[PDB]
Amino acid sequence: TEYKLKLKNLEKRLLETLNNLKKEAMNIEKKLSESEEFFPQFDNLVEEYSIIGKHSVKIFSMLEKFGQFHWFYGISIGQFLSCF
């Protein structure tokens, strides 16, 4: 985001430095080319976390049903993350 904004700023400034223009353009191109294989390897990882999550939301729900049962057995989500 900051590179594309600064690139537009450099382009309007050049309208009213081509070396650093080309270098930041190459930097912009590289921080994309490396985003190509990063995403399918990123999102392929989390299946470990889906089995984590489906248990986590069930555990919190069970403690919540203990909280609706008796007024003393209350629990917040902040305490769940602190214990996590």
Side-chain angles (χ1 to χ4, degrees), residues 1-59:
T1 52
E2 59 92 7
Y3 252 103
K4 294 316 285 178
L5 292 183
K6 289 170 59 60
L7 178 63
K8 176 58 189 64
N9 299 335
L10 190 52
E11 184 53 80
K12 64 102 186 174
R13 242 173 302 173
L14 194 137
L15 177 63
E16 52 87 15
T17 59
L18 199 141
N19 40 81
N20 54 79
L21 177 63
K22 176 61 183 61
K23 283 309 162 188
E24 69 197 56
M26 181 49 184
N27 202 351
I28 291 172
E29 177 65 275
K30 181 55 67 187
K31 60 170 143 298
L32 289 178
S33 66
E34 81 186 41
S35 69
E36 300 182 85
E37 86 300 316
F38 165 71
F39 284 73
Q41 304 315 298
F42 187 81
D43 65 346
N44 190 271
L45 178 62
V46 303
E47 323 295 327
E48 307 191 345
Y49 172 74
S50 51
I51 193 163
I52 276 166
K54 273 276 271 202
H55 298 142
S56 307
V57 59
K58 284 185 171 178
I59 285 173

